[PDB]
Amino acid sequence: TTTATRLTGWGRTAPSVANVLRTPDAEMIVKAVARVAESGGGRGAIARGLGRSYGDNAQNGGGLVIDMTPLNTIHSIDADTKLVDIDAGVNLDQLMKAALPFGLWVPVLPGTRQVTVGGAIACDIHGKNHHSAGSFGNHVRSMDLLTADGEIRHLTPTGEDAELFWATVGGNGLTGIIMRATIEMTPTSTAYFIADGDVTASLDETIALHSDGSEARYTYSSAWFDAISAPPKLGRAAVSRGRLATVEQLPAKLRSEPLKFDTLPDVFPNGLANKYTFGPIGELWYRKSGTYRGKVQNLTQFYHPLDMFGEWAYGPAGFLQYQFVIPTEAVDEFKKIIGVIQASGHYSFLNVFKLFGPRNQAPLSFPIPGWNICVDFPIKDGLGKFVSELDRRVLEFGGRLYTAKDSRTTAETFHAMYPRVDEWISVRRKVDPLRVFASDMARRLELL
Numbered sequence: 501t502t503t504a505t506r507l508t509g510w511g512r513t514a515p516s517v518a519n520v521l522r523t524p525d526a527e528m529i530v531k532a533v534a535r536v537a538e539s540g541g542g543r544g545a546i547a548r549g550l551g552r553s554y555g556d557n558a559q560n561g562g563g564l565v566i567d568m569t570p571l572n573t574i575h576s577i578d579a580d581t582k583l584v585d586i587d588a589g590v591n592l593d594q595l596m597k598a599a600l601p602f603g604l605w606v607p608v609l610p611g612t613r614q615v616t617v618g619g620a621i622a623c624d625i626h627g628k629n630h631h632s633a634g635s636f637g638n639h640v641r642s643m644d645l646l647t648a649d650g651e652i653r654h655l656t657p658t659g660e661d662a663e664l665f666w667a668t669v670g671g672n673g674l675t676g677i678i679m680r681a682t683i684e685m686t687p688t689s690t691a692y693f694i695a696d697g698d699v700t701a702s703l704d705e706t707i708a709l710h711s712d713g714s715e716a717r718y719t720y721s722s723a724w725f726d727a728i729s730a731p732p733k734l735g736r737a738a739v740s741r742g743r744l745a746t747v748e749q750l751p752a753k754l755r756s757e758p759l760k761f762d763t764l765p766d767v768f769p770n771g772l773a774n775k776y777t778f779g780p781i782g783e784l785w786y787r788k789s790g791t792y793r794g795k796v797q798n799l800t801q802f803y804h805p806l807d808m809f810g811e812w813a814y815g816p817a818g819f820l821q822y823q824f825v826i827p828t829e830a831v832d833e834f835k836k837i838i839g840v841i842q843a844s845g846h847y848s849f850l851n852v853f854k855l856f857g858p859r860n861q862a863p864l865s866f867p868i869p870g871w872n873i874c875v876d877f878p879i880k881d882g883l884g885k886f887v888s889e890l891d892r893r894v895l896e897f898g899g900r901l902y903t904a905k906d907s908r909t910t911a912e913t914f915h916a917m918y919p920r921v922d923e924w925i926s927v928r929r930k931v932d933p934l935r936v937f938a939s940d941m942a943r944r945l946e947l948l
């Protein structure tokens with residue numbers, strides 16, 4: 501069914517009207533692309549997954565949007581080769597659940613499991629294990645791409661079509677529609693983590709902990725940090741680090757089903773704050789609560805600690821998500837940018853801190869080794885012009901923004917942040933001379 505629909509990214513801003521094709525028939529999808537290609541110039545087409553990108557990369561005002569979520573077959577899982585063969589519309593939660601009984605683990609998980617394989621590839625997503633596992637694109641062994649000429653090209657990371665493979669990774673759907681892919685999974689003997697927790701008192705402590713060599717001992721690592729408090733409390737963090745557990749590390753209670761996968765506003769409607777919360781006893785409690793060694797945790801506990809806070813309303817509309825990475829060596833610059841945020845009069849509570857490891861060969865891939873930050877600002881007067889200033893500082897400090905989080909940076913800024921963009925554009929124009937694939941983001945960021 502083709503239907504005119506008003507679409508936004510997860511941020512609920514920059515809405516646009518598109519014809520949304522929603523069909524489980526792959527032949528039908530090929531036809532829609534064949535059609536647009538024969539128009540000989542229109543507003544093009546773009547794939548859309550579960551719409552978890554905050555910005556405008558999965559919409560196409562006055563053009564076609566192809567919803568890929570019906571194409572959601574897991575074709576095979578093989579424990580011996582560790583390979584999964586899945587439709588692009590398969591989501592990571594579905595995949596995780598299907599693969600666990602084989603002793604296989606999704607090699608890269610984002611902070612939400614409601615993302616499609618196509619969206620994971622097109623945004624080259626990263627997770628808590630980036631420093632040890634790279635991003636999603638690193639684990640794709642092949643994918644089938646529906647190109648503008650209406651052909652399906654079988655792409656591999658090292659084969660004859662390697663250039664197009666690596667332009668599609670992180671390509672935000674602008675090389676064509678990923679129909680199907682083979683992913684190499686991580687072997688695992690349990691669905692649990694062994695975790696170590698640390699709590700730092702300041703930005704300086706947070707940085708030292710990430711720079712002291714301890715990161716090499718954990719496959720998974722991420723932190724919450726304070727973005728509101730004045731120094732020295734600015735940049736103090738709760739750090740969660742771990743690795744997948746082996747069967748013997750589990751307590752007997754859980755050894756029987758090692759691979760099995762199994763809130764607070766309902767218990768405490770008054771809130772969590774008491775008379776002690778912000779004084780010295782509170783500080784002591786938080787420090788001890790966030791400090792531990794060898795704690796066995798399931799996925800929700802280790803990986804989705806946002807889940808227990810239920811209704812606590814800070815992620816829908818009226819918030820601007822901002823994510824950037826600063827190269828590792830630029831520690832002084834990084835610290836400066838954190839100070840700029842604190843003094844801005846814009847207050848973010850939901851803050852992510854993570855040290856990225858080595859980048860991959862995708863020219864538009866977001867992650868580079870360095871200090872990754874997410875912040876979430878309430879929309880209020882002055883914010884648009886302030887984040888523009890942030891863009892300037894991110895750029896001048898060698899860093900970049902993430903397309904999966906952006907709806908408002910300029911083409912000029914984006915291009916300077918991605919010095920391989922011309923290289924990428926040359927590939928896209930080779931594979932899509934007629935701009936059959938197009939999106940609001942493509943036009944805004946001049947990637948069309």
Ligand SMILES: Cc1cc2nc3c(=O)[nH]c(=O)nc-3n(C[C@H](O)[C@H](O)[C@H](O)COP(=O)(O)OP(=O)(O)OC[C@H]3O[C@@H](n4cnc5c(N)ncnc54)[C@H](O)[C@@H]3O)c2cc1C
Nearest residue numbers: 549550551552553610611616618619625626672673678904
């Ligand atoms: C709560 C939350 C937490 C998050 N945490 C993280 C995180 O930790 N790390 C991280 O990297 N990201 C994170 N994200 C961002 C998210 O992982 C990406 O935006 C991801 O691309 C969303 O997948 P999707 O299927 O919803 O794709 P959509 O947002 O629907 O589309 C995103 C892009 O993928 C393209 N696309 C989708 N399907 C296909 C296809 N079949 N072929 C070609 N192109 C396609 C679209 O054209 C678009 O350019 C988070 C998002 C949310 C809401």
Ligand SMILES: O=C(O)c1nc2ccc(C(F)(F)F)cc2nc1NCc1ccc(C(F)(F)F)cc1
Nearest residue numbers: 611626627628722723724806850851852854874
């Ligand atoms: O909501 C999001 O967009 C989000 N983005 C993330 C980007 C990177 C990473 C990284 F890999 F680095 F750990 C994690 C991300 N997590 C996201 N959301 C889940 C989430 C956000 C904030 C918090 C915290 F504030 F710390 F409690 C806890 C969980």
Ligand SMILES: C[C@H](CO)OC[C@@H](C)OC[C@@H](C)O
Nearest residue numbers: 722723724738739740805852
């Ligand atoms: C951001 C990252 C989740 O991938 O870490 C959150 C952990 C440290 O929880 C922090 C608590 C206090 O909110």
